[PDB]
Symmetry: D2
Subunit: 292 residues, 4 copies
């Protein structure tokens, strides 16, 4: 079953010290905050929100092991392990398998307009590296890609589905219609209820790091058929999303966590470093408005 892939999966921040060192103690404290205080169903690690492009190859493995250790099998684990370095991505798949990750994902080849063919080969080679379920990222165009064409990706060995993060809910509806056998994790935080309505059961998002409660409220209202409440709670949540990102996203999440006694550290360069007081007031503003 995909039962373990139901519910909320924050895209986990990766804690760094002020000087840009991987803050190992922080990683564990974050995982504990998510499992125990946020009460998440799973954790999605080393994605965009985890600052993965700013992590060294060894930083990556360290975080994967540290997370595995802190979780202690309590919640579902997914590691985002894709990069342009195919050999590193292969070892990472093995390491995910070894550490008992529930699934992996790999972001679409970026920067260059890599072709459908190149993308297919990218994902094909990675599937032979280990037997661990794979989620691909949704990709509208590569050099110029039909919902039929994306099906070819979906059928590669070990691929169970797709992380769907595009703002295009018609494509999402078309995929849910064509591939009812595949798992689609919905990655568009401000359209959670929309997601639910076309059959999404699992959600990966940055914003669930510190407001799983507000997101679960929408899901619980939806299952209980309180349609008015689905609307009001969504308006509130999307208020929260927009207030949140009036300062840098990862700086805000890390500050909110620090305000809650979690050692979540700081972003790396080149992300902007705010004055401690400025980001503290922002953390308080979000916390007081939304997270009581």
């Amino acid at each position: 079953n995909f039962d373990k892939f139901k519910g909320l999966f924050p895209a986990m921040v990766t804690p760094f010290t002020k000087d840009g060192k991987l803050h190992k103690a922080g990683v564990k404290e974050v995982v504990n905050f998510l499992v125990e205080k946020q009460k998440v169903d799973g954790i999605y690690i080393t994605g965009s929100t985890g600052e993965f492009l700013l992590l060294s190859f060894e930083d990556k493995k360290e975080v994967m092991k540290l997370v595995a250790e802190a979780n202690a099998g309590r919640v579902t684990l997914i590691a985002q392990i894709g990069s342009l370095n195919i050999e590193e991505t292969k070892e990472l798949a093995k390491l995910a398998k070894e550490l008992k990750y529930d699934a992996i994902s790999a972001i679409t080849p970026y920067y260059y307009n890599f072709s459908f063919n190149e993308t297919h080969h990218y994902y094909e080679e990675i599937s032979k590296a280990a037997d661990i379920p794979m989620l691909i990222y949704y990709l509208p165009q590569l050099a110029g890609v039909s919902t039929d064409q994306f099906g070819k990706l979906l059928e590669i060995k070990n691929v169970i589905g797709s992380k769907y993060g595009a703002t295009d809910l018609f494509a999402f509806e078309r995929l849910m219609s064509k591939y009812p056998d595949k798992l689609f994790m919905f990655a568009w935080d401000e359209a959670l209820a929309m997601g639910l309505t076309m059959g999404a059961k699992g959600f990966i998002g940055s914003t669930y790091n510190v407001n799983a409660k507000g997101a679960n409220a929408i899901i619980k209202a939806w299952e209980a058929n309180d349609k008015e409440a689905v609307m009001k709670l969504t308006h509130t949540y999307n208020d929260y999303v927009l207030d949140l990102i009036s300062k840098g996203l990862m700086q805000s999440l890390k500050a909110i966590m620090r305000l809650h006694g979690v050692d979540a550290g700081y972003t790396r360069k080149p992300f902007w470093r705010y004055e401690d007081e400025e980001i503290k007031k922002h953390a308080e503003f979000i916390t007081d408005k939304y997270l009581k």
Copy 2:
């Protein structure tokens, strides 16, 4: 309150003869078919689906009168009356009121990139014409974008009751629903009907309701009934219909299906492509048999 604006409002097609004359007896038959067979809650006339840019000023007034007559107060009526001629628009608004149209709408100034200020003045002028509710079109960007806030100044213009929202941007729609709960937002994106209902839309305007009101009403019914899985299944079927339907020109396909049902809905006007009779007839049957049986 806004109760008369609940349900389905097909964007009515405008029947023309094969040589493109306004087919006056066709207009009334289409109205009958929509009320009697599609069981619509309302009808939305002379928009893009009604080929309004291909109508003369005299055609527009005539269509309004023929619709008003055949309807006979049975369903709610909204007239899209906007163009670049502000005096013709004002006159169509007074005619709307006279004919007891429930609301009017006007498309955004088009072709040129008209500024916010110009668009606001254009709607302001229209409001002083007749005392009838007005729905403005939703506006993403105006000669370089318009916020939730900047758009609200359009919503506050005298007689403006709300907006016809057709954009495929469901976040923006959510934002408008939050900020303006006292305004009427008619939802015009047929393929996101259930997603529209989920965020509070209660009225739906669209070309696809001309011949599949039953299929869209099925979605609405399952939604109000809390049948989550039927909402999904019926939307999958309905959107299959939409993609199948527009594999030929929309209005040719919609008029061909009406003719197939024995309704004198006529044909489109130049420069829309005119298909061979048998090709468009087979398309019509294909749609009918697959979805409309």
Copy 3:
């Protein structure tokens, strides 16, 4: 060389209206006289975007065409933009242009709806049958799906079609068309890249900005023909400074106010275009004139 009459600057002529909104028939003549005699233009492109053609009635259009013919009295080349979604009207406009001795006609792409290639091809095909007068098609990047260099050639092969008015800011597509179709005429309608156009073989230029700055635009051409490459640069910076400054207020309101300042009865824009306060627009007209048109 039969395209000789299509060389040089072709202002996209404004259409004078009264403050009321009426077609100002006397103004039409004065504008034409202004452009021939003071701007010393090579031709005039009438009832295009800049001529507010979408706010013109069918009669207004025929009237403007007749009046421009009469005022020009054959002095310069005349091209009439006549396209609309009313095909029977465009057909009559094509016959009228022929009757009035216009040198070419043009027709905008079918707009507002996403018309397909086959619909666009059929539209242009029906027009070409109406009268024996040279046709310039508008350059079309994308119709609802991309239009290729090869696909646009199917439009250029329609009877009477001699070329294309090319307005996109994509100068690569332009280089490609001049390479593939040197037997066709390409009227270059991106004023802020005049010298770029020259460089790739453009000899005719249709633009809003030549209504009041034909001298500035001619200086760039002359510098280029004289191989004064530094001056091509300097004269472009200046000209483009002028364009940006000009469109700081609405274009057509700016163009008409600049003409009115020079004593030309150019009138005003129609609704829904913004009507500026009397003095605000005059002062704008003075600024541009003092800075660029001395």
Copy 4:
């Protein structure tokens, strides 16, 4: 004040790799020789997109810099693209550039994330303190949602002598030449070389100059010589060549043309497509025979 060293053709060098992906070190030298002696370039631009920089390790990059500084021995101008999301590795690479007497460095726009202006500025600010070597910033249309004025504050940062301008936007290029006459802008759009010339570009960086520098020098010479018609005809041939070249993958076609001239320029690194060996060689043979004889 004097930018004489940066006039002419500056191919974006390819980075040679073995069939199985190692950094073919001697291959780097055979390419550097082949561009200097046989393509007759004025300069080389190393470890850019065309040099597959994102597929190179930190050590790889350091190695390529050293190898190039060696095989050139000061014969042509050298520019290093050294930018990445690791600020400390860029800070180092700019000291390595200053040490190997590189004439210029550049750093790409922070990529993948939508980094803001403030972030972009601070990142160039940081890279400058590292080493007193002149910097060329990449031209940037938009950061996280970008004034020609704002882009000037980036030009003001210590050690910045101008910009690598690659956008297909010839208007904003004309605008930049107008406002900052005291700055070097290297023109990085191969298909509009003659249009860059027209507005004052004097140095050119690009991937196509790897195997057809002669064909592009032909355009510059005709231009300076005021031969208007040949500028046109020679541009048309060059752009036929460019569209022909990129009918298969760029780096694979280029590397394969080089291997065809007995230059050991190897292959691309994963994830780039690897062609069946007869396919890309028939492509190498076609381009060479039609354009490079």
